[PDB]
Symmetry: C3
Subunit: 206 residues, 3 copies
């Protein structure tokens, strides 16, 4: 009998069907004007910072329980991008959940099925974003691979990370992007990226 | 004596302190939601069960009663009250609909409400009672004491929700019989007994 | 080291890490709310205290400061600073109003805020101080260091709230004297002292 609410990062079971579907903790929705992040110490959702510019997060954004972007995650990202000395960013694995429904509040769990991801390198750190579709979603529910995902939605998501920290001076001066989008990958690779981040988590917290 | 962690919303709060005249309730779904939320029993975190399949919103505050379980005693009584055999409990905490004039947009909250009645529902030989209660000190519903004093238009809205939120168009076009059976409504005293029985089911199981 | 459960918002989080230059705050009420929420001390779950009685919304992010307690030391300083005797603490955590330009619709969150002052309020010999703070990195209020740099229209808005949210029409038509006493405002250093004392009250209580 669970007497207390479990920490969203350590509590939930990540997967029960060998990563075909995942339990996800949502931190940010399109409705938010600030960036929320799960407070590691307390397990309470916390304001990280207000949105600096004119962006909203264009999907449900959160973390995967029982994942940690660590040694194995960094090495695979480095291998997959032909890069050496790539380390993990030290946080849980980021996931973007596609849904046609309106969710206005974060601090929730949901079931989502991975279809791919965006491999991002941010100054020698792997900052992968898993892309998943909400289970039984009326629009995205039957998408099984990222190649079946509307390219306009992927561009929206890439645009968010490319601009949400870009100063006007940097955009007018055409300064190169501070994050490197190495490209997209599909379901199987995403499941591998999740598998590795889970092993990183298991070794450090279990 | 100092709670260092947040209590599980199902097991933690005290159900009643005044012999079921008012109840502490945990809210999972509001009229503002477009998905059906449900408390994850294992973790105590609010979780998306499924998106709304059709064109319904939940027309009230919907949630559960702490320290209740729809078990053996609940099933036998529901069968007794509907004169139907082999009626079992649905295995979940007891459902409650809270009437309020105010706009509540987020779930994952507690509130105090007063029961005034309930809807006896059978879903394929399972008791799926919905307790009807009024938010304490609500400016419109606060003084309502029995379901007979509740506006019938609001009760029809609530009955319509459960009669349609899982009804496919084909089943409606072919006039297939409803998959849930509304056996009728009951008043305050009967509602308090259903809560009492569901509370005993919980105590015997834990 | 693995926090398995979500921490109680009042007892769990660390109040300050920079000697009260910035504070961790737990938000109970936002401008979007139509009811008054309050952290339930026993369970640590956000709970509806009562609906808004009249035509008010809370004009800022409103909550409590973790690990604070408005006790004896808090009352004595309030009495000294207001030249009134026998002022006791109100027994709750220290209240805080957070100013932000952004729209936050959901409570039950943590955030970092920098105090700039506060409102000293006496409610029938009880200190009901309201700390005034600005959301860290807020695009508008972020650089405000003292309450004297805060627009008086915002302060009037906050004072108007506490002066009217419990004022019946009859009491206003008959111009009956206010039930709460606004003794005045204070600046950054003094607010830090009020928080320091309230933190000491809490530590001495446990
Ligand atoms: Na990351
Ligand atoms: Na049920
Ligand atoms: Na107070």
């Amino acid at each position: 009998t669970p007497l207390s609410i479990a920490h969203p990062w350590h509590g939930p079971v990540l997967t029960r069907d060998d990563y075909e579907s995942l339990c996800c903790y949502i931190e940010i929705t399109p409705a938010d004007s600030v960036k929320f992040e799960l407070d590691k110490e307390t397990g309470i959702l916390k304001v990280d910072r207000p949105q600096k510019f004119s962006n909203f997060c264009p999907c449900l954004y959160g973390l995967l329980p029982k994942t940690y972007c660590g040694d194995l995650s960094g090495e695979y990202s480095g291998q997959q991008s032909n890069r050496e000395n790539i380390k993990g960013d030290g946080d849980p694995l980021d996931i973007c959940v596609l849904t046609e429904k309106n969710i206005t509040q974060g601090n929730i769990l949901l079931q989502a099925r991975p279809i791919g991801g965006i491999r991002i390198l941010d100054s020698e750190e792997a900052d992968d974003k898993i892309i998943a579709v909400l289970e039984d979603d009326l629009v995205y529910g039957n998408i099984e691979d990222i190649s079946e995902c509307p390219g306009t939605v992927l561009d929206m998501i890439q645009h968010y990370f490319l601009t949400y920290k870009a100063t006007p001076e940097s955009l007018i001066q055409a300064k190169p992007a501070k994050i490197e989008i190495v490209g997209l990958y599909g379901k199987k690779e995403a499941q591998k990226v999740i598998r590795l981040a889970h092993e990183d988590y298991c070794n450090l917290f279990m």
